[PDB]
């Protein structure tokens, strides 16, 4: 496995047709997972499954610019389960990140950060055993 938090370099940032795949297993009694696609200190795309926010499971997505969080986009469809292996695929499309979990479409997140080729790191954190993190051009 990989050590969490884990940093995956994205050389020359991202670009449409780039597919990023994260394989892991959620720990028992998990509280959170986070993917942070960063442009330097900014977070272009924060993808944050929360297992207990007011006794609901929710996915919170956002962007952080100059250390300020923007408007959250929330998704109540929640495909993760404590204890279970997962696959998160993030496909960069021209206008949005497209996220599928376990081969089922989950959400899209429109690009707020425009300099895609400067989004050069993915941080992976939270209550998971991380198996692999990689990318491919499709
Ligand atoms: O927006 C993503 C960001 O959220 C922070 O938590 C928010 C919270 O979601 C919101 O309901 C409350 O009113 O303000 C909190 C602080 O901005 C998280 O702390 C952060 O890690 C991100 O997940």
UniProtKB/Swiss-Prot annotation:
Modified residues (Phosphoserine): 76
Record GO biological process: eosinophil chemotaxis; epithelial cell differentiation; innate immune response; macrophage chemotaxis; monocyte chemotaxis; mononuclear cell migration; mRNA processing; negative regulation of endocytosis
Span of domain Galectin: 6-136
Subcellular compartments: Cytoplasm; Nucleus; Secreted
Positions of a beta-D-galactoside binding: 69-75
GO molecular function, one term: IgE binding
GO cellular component, one term: cell surface
Tissue occurrence: A major expression is found in the colonic epithelium. It is also abundant in the activated macrophages. Expressed in fetal membranes.
Alphabetic keyword roster: Acetylation, Cytoplasm, Differentiation, Disulfide bond, IgE-binding protein, Immunity, Innate immunity, Lectin, mRNA processing, mRNA splicing, Nucleus, Phosphoprotein, Repeat, Secreted, Spliceosome
Motif placement: Nuclear export signal: 114-129
Role of this protein: Galactose-specific lectin which binds IgE. May mediate with the alpha-3, beta-1 integrin the stimulation by CSPG4 of endothelial cells migration. Together with DMBT1, required for terminal differentiation of columnar epithelial cells during early embryogenesis. In the nucleus: acts as a pre-mRNA splicing factor. Involved in acute inflammatory responses including neutrophil activation and adhesion, chemoattraction of monocytes macrophages, opsonization of apoptotic neutrophils, and activation of mast cells.
Quaternary structure annotation from Swiss-Prot or TrEMBL: Probably forms homo- or heterodimers. Interacts with DMBT1. Interacts with CD6 and ALCAM. Forms a complex with the ITGA3, ITGB1 and CSPG4. Interacts with LGALS3BP, LYPD3, ZFTRAF1 and UACA. Interacts with TRIM16; this interaction mediates autophagy of damage endomembranes. Interacts with cargo receptor TMED10; the interaction mediates the translocation from the cytoplasm into the ERGIC (endoplasmic reticulum-Golgi intermediate compartment) and thereby secretion.
Full protein name: Galectin-3
Species this chain originates from: Homo sapiens
Residues of the full protein shown: 113 to 250 of 250
